[PDB]
Paper text:
Here, we show that Helicobacter pylori [name] is involved in DNA transport through the cell membrane, and is required for the handling of the single-stranded DNA once it is delivered into the cytoplasm. Furthermore, we show that [name] is a membrane-associated protein with affinity for single-stranded DNA.
Thus, in order to help crystallisation, we generated a gene fusion between the full-length [name] gene and an artificial αRep binder coding sequence selected from a highly diverse library of artificial repeat proteins based on thermostable HEAT-like repeats. Diffracting crystals were however obtained with the purified fusion protein in the presence of PRPP and the 3D structure of full-length [name] in complex with PRPP was solved at 2.5 Å resolution. The fusion (αRep: residues 1–229, linker: residues 230–236, [name]: residues 237–427) is present in four copies in the asymmetric unit, organised in two domain-swapped dimers: the αRep of one fusion covers the [name] of the other one. In comparison an interface of only 526 Å2 connects both dimers together, demonstrating that the tetrameric form is probably due to the crystal packing. The Zn-finger is connected by a five amino acid linker to the rest of the hood domain (residues L22–T54), structured into a small sheet of two β strands followed by a kinked α helix. A Zn2+ ion is liganded into the protein via the four cysteine residues (C3, C6, C15 and C18 in pink in Fig. 5c, d) which are highly conserved within the [name] family. The [name] CTD (residues L55–D190, the terminal E191 is not defined in the electron density) shares the common core of the amidophosphoribosyl transferase type 1 fold (RMSD between 2.6 and 3 Å for 100 to 130 aligned residues, PDB number 5ZGO48 as an example, according to the DALI server). The “PRPP loop” carries the canonical 157DDIITTGTTL166 active site signature allowing the binding of the ribose-5-phosphate group of the PRPP. The most variable “PPi loop” (A89 to H100) allowing the binding of the PPi group of the PRPP is slightly longer than the standard four amino acids loops. The “flexible loop” (L120 to T144) closes the pocket of the binding site occupied in our structure by the PRPP (red sticks in Fig. 5c, e).
Author numbering:
A (entry chain A), B (entry chain C): 16 to 426
The structure:
């Protein structure tokens, strides 16, 4: 590195060489450049003074705090702006009182950068002056003071920030709503409830999102089961989107079988198929799967009306589980049919060997129109025994089965 | 409707007619079918008894509560299961004590359906018996008791549910973690902190998501600026994904100009370009835009290395705003270049008429290799004055400008 070369270039006669040396020492900043840059703050030209101030904040050494405090009283508003920004970047408590005075500066950029620096330092002494800054003539200063109050997290700012939600500027209302959510509490919850209902823009977005996780509280309010956010469906769209959809194809009895999820990735959701609460989760997964499958059929060219057959469930389930899973999957040219195929025995293959499954068949029975174009759907495929049996049985009845869907794959 | 026809079919001699009448009255359920269905609960066949019980819960009339309580002591476990489910669907407090006894049933399905019904009713009296049910031999009963305790929301269940996070079944741990998050509090926050760090599966997912919004609390912890969730980037991927990306194309000086967002949809994020906190939001938006644009170039066939030129920013910004916006956009065959194009005046067109803009030009200056394949990038297009001027200037210098990018559109 050339750190020591740039340190020498700070005392050059050429202005463009002195400036480039200060900017270079801001990127490749070493503690060796701190003392030479402190001297560069007393340069004749303001372009060198502001570049040295910028570089000192980028280095972050506590030695530059006192000369940067003197640079807050500089004749040039660009040098004052850089000194205020740098003081917050360093984060030393000594800059708090000098930065509080900079909040009353003539230049709106110096006021704004001093407010942001006070939030970066996080000292409680800045709370009252930043509350006054929420009534500045420049909206950029108001916005920066609201953001700084949220970074400090002092409750003394709650009522002034609630009044800032009625500001004329959209970015100021947004900064105030954010600051409120960062502080939290009962007065904030009540302000968010009014802002979500009557507010607009990004301020309303913050309020709506805050109430999804904090508000709406009740013993039994409908919530998402993977993130606990308030949601009418047991899986919010964000959580549903995060579920890994892995498409696989196997050929069983000449019929193509499509799976959409791996058992290892949705194990708990599958295990909860006979739970009261975790029941309505599977129709959400099959709706996601059916939407991708309908695109596959269009790419294939299979645009004929198709009729779904589900393996009829027994009294061991809370509701018509297969009917709900099939109703969710069906969309586009897919249409659901109920009670066409049923097993004469209620044996469970879960956790059983391939030998047990092959020796315990479900005696299938078909009851419906045989001239229709069908497809069968089931929740999971482990060994393919159940599907091979259903396909073989319907093939003997001369029934058109275009494909089979097994939502989840364990094979 | 045929409600009164099905009411008569309940007293038919044919078994298949009596069953279909009870099932039909469960879908097209009227209060007129309640008294006939109460009589159908005392049928000789269990298939009629369970269908009448199912239909009574679907109707939800309080008159069926007492005969369904008697149906909890039925000889058939399928009729008991249906009576327990229906009692929770109605939600009458009178079923609480009879359902508490059903938690000790021989059939694991009756115990499970009674636990879920107790959670639907929401009465506090079920808390202690449901806590005992968290130690059932059947994991489906344990899972249902954990879900029911979360629906009641009584704090007496916190410590037994914290012990359920160490259950041998994955769905039971998941149900217990959900129930804890639904109750909330300091003991829950501490249990979520250990579960997020040391747990696995969906139980860990719930814990991680709960801590993103409730935990990690500090005065200045890095948070998302649209949902307040803990996030190192000022916009979490979920919030970034929700931002409406609207691609538009205009031709300025023969050069195609691409925009990716509407000003009306990201107004506050654009307005905050010169704010300290809201600064790093725009490079996130241009990274999202550049990822879609790189797919457009591949579809077009423009696979040549392209070099980005940004309109150089002045001392009015916190950092190199254009450099950060260009660095975020560039990916794939797009490579960034800095300080090649600069305006000799710092006039601001924001909120000015088309007349003001056309009479106040930015005297552009190019400094770089002219033989390169370039593209220019800017944050917003309102009237196209700035872009028409930059393109016209570079065209006179015989410089290859393949296209222009204006992240945001106000035109
Ligand atoms: O590919 P396979 O080896 O045939 O296994 C798949 C079958 O296993 C499950 O049924 P199960 O018999 O366990 O019924 P259940 O719904 O009563 O648990 C599942 O619902 C499928 O029907
Ligand atoms: O399409 P147009 O009509 O030319 O307007 C677009 C220009 O307006 C803004 O610049 P501005 O002059 O406001 O600079 P600023 O960043 O200092 O506010 C923006 O950054 C573009 O340069
Ligand atoms: Mg099954
Ligand atoms: Mg559907
Ligand atoms: Mg500009
Ligand atoms: Mg990038
Ligand atoms: Zn969710
Ligand atoms: Zn977010």
């Amino acid at each position: 590195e050339k750190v020591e070369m740039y340190i020498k270039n700070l005392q050059d006669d050429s202005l463009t060489v002195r400036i480039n040396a200060a900017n270079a020492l801001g990127k490749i900043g070493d503690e060796r450049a701190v003392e030479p840059l402190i001297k560069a703050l007393k340069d004749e030209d303001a372009l060198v003074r502001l570049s040295a101030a910028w570089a000192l904040g980028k280095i972050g050494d506590e030695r530059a705090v006192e000369p940067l405090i003197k640079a807050l009283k500089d004749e040039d508003s660009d040098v004052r702006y850089r000194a205020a920004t740098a003081l917050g970047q360093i984060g030393d408590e000594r800059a708090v009182e000098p930065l509080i005075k900079a909040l009353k500066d003539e230049d709106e950029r110096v006021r704004q950068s001093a407010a942001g620096a006070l939030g970066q330092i996080g000292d409680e002494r800045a709370v009252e002056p930043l509350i006054k800054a929420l009534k500045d003539e420049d909206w950029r200063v108001r916005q920066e003071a609201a953001f700084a109050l949220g970074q400090i997290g002092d409750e003394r700012a709650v009522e002034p920030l609630i009044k800032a939600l009625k500001d004329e500027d959209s970015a100021v209302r947004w900064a105030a709503a954010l600051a409120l959510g960062k502080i939290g509490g009962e007065r904030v919850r009540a302000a968010m409830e009014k802002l979500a209902e009557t507010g607009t823009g990004f301020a309303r977005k913050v309020a709506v999102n805050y109430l999804e996780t904090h508000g709406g509280s009740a013993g039994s309010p409908m919530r998402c089961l993977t993130c606990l956010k308030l949601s009418f469906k047991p899986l919010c769209p964000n959580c549903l989107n995060d579920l890994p959809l892995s498409l696989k194809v196997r050929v069983l009895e000449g019929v193509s079988v499509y799976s959409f999820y791996a058992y290892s990735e949705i194990e708990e959701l599958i295990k909860s198929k006979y739970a009261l609460i975790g029941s309505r989760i599977l129709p959400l997964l099959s709706q996601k799967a059916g939407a991708e499958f309908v695109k596959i059929l269009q790419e294939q060219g299979l645009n004929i009306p198709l009729y779904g057959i589900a393996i009829d469930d027994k009294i061991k389930s809370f509701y018509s589980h297969s009917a709900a899973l099939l109703k969710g999957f069906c969309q586009g040219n897919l249409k659901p049919t109920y009670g066409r195929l049923r097993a004469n025995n209620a044996v469970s293959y879960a956790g059983k060997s391939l030998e047990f499954r092959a020796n315990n068949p479900r005696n299938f029975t078909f009851k419906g129109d045989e001239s229709l174009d069908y497809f069968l759907l089931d929740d999971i495929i482990t060994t393919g025994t159940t599907l091979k049996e259903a396909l073989k049985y319907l093939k003997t009845l001369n029934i058109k089965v275009h494909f089979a869907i097994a939502l989840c794959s364990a094979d």
